[PDB]
Design an enzyme around this catalytic site. Structure first.
Site: not given
Ligand SMILES: C=C1C[C@]23C[C@@]1(O)CC[C@H]2[C@@]12C=C[C@H](O)[C@@](C)(C(=O)O1)[C@H]2[C@@H]3C(=O)O
Lengths: 334, 447
Positions: A106-107, A118, A182, A229, A280, A311
């Site tokens: 989630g950065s 999750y 991530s 995205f 990505d 994702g």
């Protein structure tokens, strides 16, 4: 129009909804709509009754910082009635039992350990790899910036190591694997780096699309700019909200192989498994990280998926999911 | 039917409406690039979102607005001597279930012995549960065993001072009631748990400073017979009327006495025609008491349906305690009360804390020792309550994010905004200790 031809429809809907929502929760000043974010987030609750062979419960490991953790274990074979609390911390059986310590992505801002995406990923990991999974609820940004997350990861690792019902009946030691996706990849890398000098032994690392970056723009960023995205203007927002004020993107937390970092040659680092998505945005940074790990002498297996986006591991309706799960299972039970 | 994968992730999207939602997302993304940092902020702050799980309706609202069982368990990592205590408690309960009375008193004495050397919330929970089991064991053949009562007057106000459960419930109910009182000329409020009336002053004050003028306010209260044989409702009405003379709005009061809510009728309340005056029904910790009577809750729901209100606010405790088996109910209550007693550890010591603890102990004693109609602590969960309401003709009234924000702001004043967290589920709200939901608030309306 191009994104609709490389991913299934429902994954496209999910990711597009996430991107639109995070667009409306982001503010140019630097602040974040935390209350609205928590309202929009979908969460589930622990359930000690085994559903599809998995049950779970929460543990409050630190009260001064409100550090939570969700523990998943397989269903008992010799217990008809549902498990209770005395049997929760029941000593595990078997010669070798893996323990996966998982950090969500989630950065450093979105989601939480109790999020349904999750909780489902951890349940699938338990079901397929057939082991124990401990999910960590670390502090988010910009409310709590660097290094709150590494400290939370370190405390969770110490708690997992210190348990006695998680041990093994072959060498009286715990088999700890670090995992993440991530931002979880970043947290796992730094936790392993700080665990190599403390004495705790880690068996391996599992990085699922780790989030790294630098200062110079790569060809992937110029070509894939906001076409899958992932844009470049929001990458800078997340890096500015997490790193300390007055620091560029060459900080070691952003670029491990920076001139201001310590060399990994001659340092105790565990075996690693890096998964890289071809489509990505920040693809060259992940490949550069894998190349640096290979050059430093550390063992590393690279899994480059030429037509995978971000994702790809949230739904089982694709072909990358099964391959990655099989690779993880073979990596852990080796 | 809904597609499975999104349904397990947490999004209710039908399989035949995937293309529509994708096209809606594509349309929304297009007009977000033309709008500057103004529109997006206007969606972030001004407009209110409803039912985030329903992607279709949420996207429609954004588009039209821009362009006009399961038992949760939490283990606190502070116990190192309580394992024996839990073994003794479970053994005593099992012995009770199998007619092993002498063994039960032996274990009760053992529990009394071990709890002496412990500390924290576990000692208090063990003490209260030991007393409850002793009272249970005191019901064999002697037909001269009395019980206690519930002094919900001097104790519940102290609980209000100590804990955020009543403040959160009152705040959410008031927020829900005001939203349905917009545009109506005359309003009427019926309260099933009048008690002390500490949630109405705030609602009236918030309603007076409205854009259009304070509507006429009429209030009808229902309460159990007084313990000291007095007229408490008359005094409450006098204070509320006195507080209503500084709002430039009319005020009326009415008192009602009834042992239960199952004997009420829609004709006794003297209801004016609905076309000229709206009606709102409020209940705070008063619906689960009618679960013991066979046919009381159905009667009350029928009366409410006959009243035909515009909103119906219900606040309850989120836990399953109505199980037929004594052992399962004992375990559930044990864990729920253990988590509720662990949340009041950081609160500074005061008389209010002791009074709230005595209230919880009385709750435990009534829930364990008493059986039959005398048992009023019959808690349920959100699914059970929704199933009960859905077979009567009520629809879920999804609460708005604005209430989420106000509840979080009011929850940040308690313990520097630590521990307690708000969540959302099917248009409802939940106040819980970390990830353990303790009390839920919901609003319903006629279908
Ligand atoms: C703004 C963001 C952040 C995303 C990418 C995105 O462009 C869209 C939504 C985020 C996200 C949502 C869930 C997953 O954790 C993640 C890795 C993803 O695939 O998509 C998440 C991912 C991330 O946190 O890096």
């Amino acid at each position: 129009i191009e994104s609709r031809t490389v991913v299934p429809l429902n994954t496209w809907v999910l990711i597009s909804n996430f991107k639109v929502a995070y667009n409306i929760l982001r503010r140019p000043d630097g602040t974040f709509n935390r209350h609205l974010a928590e309202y929009l987030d979908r969460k589930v609750t622990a359930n000690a009754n085994p559903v599809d062979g998995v049950f779970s419960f929460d543990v409050l490991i630190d009260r001064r910082i409100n550090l939570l953790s969700r523990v998943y274990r397989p269903a008992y074979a010799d217990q008809e009635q549902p498990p209770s609390i005395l049997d929760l911390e029941k000593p595990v059986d078997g010669d070798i039992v893996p323990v996966i310590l998982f950090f969500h992505g989630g950065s450093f801002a979105h989601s939480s350990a109790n999020s349904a995406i999750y909780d489902t990923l951890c349940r699938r990991l338990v079901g397929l790899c057939k082991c124990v999974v401990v999910s960590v609820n670390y502090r988010r940004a910009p409310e709590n910036p660097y290094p709150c997350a590494y400290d939370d990861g370190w405390i969770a690792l110490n708690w997992v190591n210190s348990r006695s019902w998680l041990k093994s009946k072959k060498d009286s030691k715990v088999h700890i694997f670090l995992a993440g996706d991530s931002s979880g990849g970043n947290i796992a890398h730094n936790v392993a780096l700080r665990a190599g000098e403390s004495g705790i032994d880690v068996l391996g690392n599992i990085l699922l699309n780790p989030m790294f970056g630098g200062n110079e723009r790569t060809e992937s960023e110029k070509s894939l700019d906001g076409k899958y995205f992932v844009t470049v203007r929001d990458r800078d927002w997340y890096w500015k909200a997490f790193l300390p004020e007055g620091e560029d993107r060459e900080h070691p937390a952003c670029n491990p192989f920076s001139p201001r970092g310590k060399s990994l040659e001659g340092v105790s680092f565990p075996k690693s498994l890096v998964v890289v998505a071809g489509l990505d945005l920040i693809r060259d940074w992940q490949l550069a990280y894998a190349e640096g790990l290979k050059k430093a002498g550390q063992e590393v297996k690279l899994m480059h998926l030429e037509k995978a986006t971000v994702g790809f591991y949230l739904l089982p309706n694709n072909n990358h999911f099964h391959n990655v799960m099989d690779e993880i299972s073979a990596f852990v039970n080796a | 039917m809904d597609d499975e994968l999104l349904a397990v992730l947490g999004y209710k999207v039908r399989s035949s409406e995937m293309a529509e939602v994708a096209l809606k997302l594509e349309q929304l993304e297009t007009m977000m690039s033309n709008v500057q940092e103004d529109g997006l902020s206007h969606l972030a702050t001004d407009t209110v979102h409803y039912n985030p799980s329903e992607l279709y309706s949420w996207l429609d609202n954004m588009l039209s607005e821009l362009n006009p069982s399961t038992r949760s368990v939490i283990l606190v990592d502070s116990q190192e001597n309580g394992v024996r205590l839990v073994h003794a408690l479970m053994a005593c309960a099992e012995a009770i279930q199998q007619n092993n009375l002498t063994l039960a008193e032996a274990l009760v004495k053992q529990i009394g012995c071990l709890a002496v050397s412990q500390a924290g919330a576990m000692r208090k929970v063990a003490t209260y549960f030991a007393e409850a089991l002793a009272r249970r064991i005191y019901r064999l053949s002697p037909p001269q065993n009395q019980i206690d009562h519930c002094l919900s007057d001097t104790l519940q106000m102290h609980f209000y001072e100590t804990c955020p459960y009543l403040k959160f419930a009152h705040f959410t109910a008031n927020q829900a009631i005001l939203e349905a009182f917009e545009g109506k000329k005359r309003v009427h409020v019926i309260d099933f748990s009048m008690n002390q009336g500490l949630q109405w002053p705030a609602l009236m004050q918030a309603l007076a400073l409205r854009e259009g003028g304070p509507p006429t306010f009429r209030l009808t209260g229902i309460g159990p017979p007084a313990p000291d044989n007095s007229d408490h409702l008359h005094e409450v009405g006098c204070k509320l009327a006195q507080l209503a003379e500084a709002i430039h709005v009319e005020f009326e009061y009415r008192g009602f006495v009834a042992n239960s809510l199952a004997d009420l009728d829609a004709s006794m309340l003297e209801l004016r025609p609905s076309d000229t005056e709206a009606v709102a029904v409020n209940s705070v910790f008063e619906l689960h008491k009618l679960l013991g009577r066979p046919g009381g809750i159905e009667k009350v729901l029928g009366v409410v349906k006959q009243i035909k209100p515009v909103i119906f606010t219900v606040v309850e405790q989120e836990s399953n305690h109505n199980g037929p088996v004594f052992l399962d109910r004992f375990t559930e209550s044990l864990h729920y009360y253990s988590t509720l007693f662990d949340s009041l550890e950081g609160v500074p010591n005061s008389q209010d804390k002791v009074m709230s603890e005595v209230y919880l102990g009385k709750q435990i004693c009534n829930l364990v020792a008493c059986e039959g109609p005398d048992r009023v602590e019959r808690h349920e969960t959100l699914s059970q309550w929704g199933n009960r309401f859905g077979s009567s003709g009520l629809a879920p009234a999804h609460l708005g994010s604005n209430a989420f924000k106000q509840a979080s702001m009011l929850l940040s004043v308690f313990n520097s905004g630590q521990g307690y967290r708000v969540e959302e589920s099917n248009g409802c709200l939940m106040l819980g200790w970390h990830t353990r939901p303790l009390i839920t608030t919901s609003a319903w309306k006629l279908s």
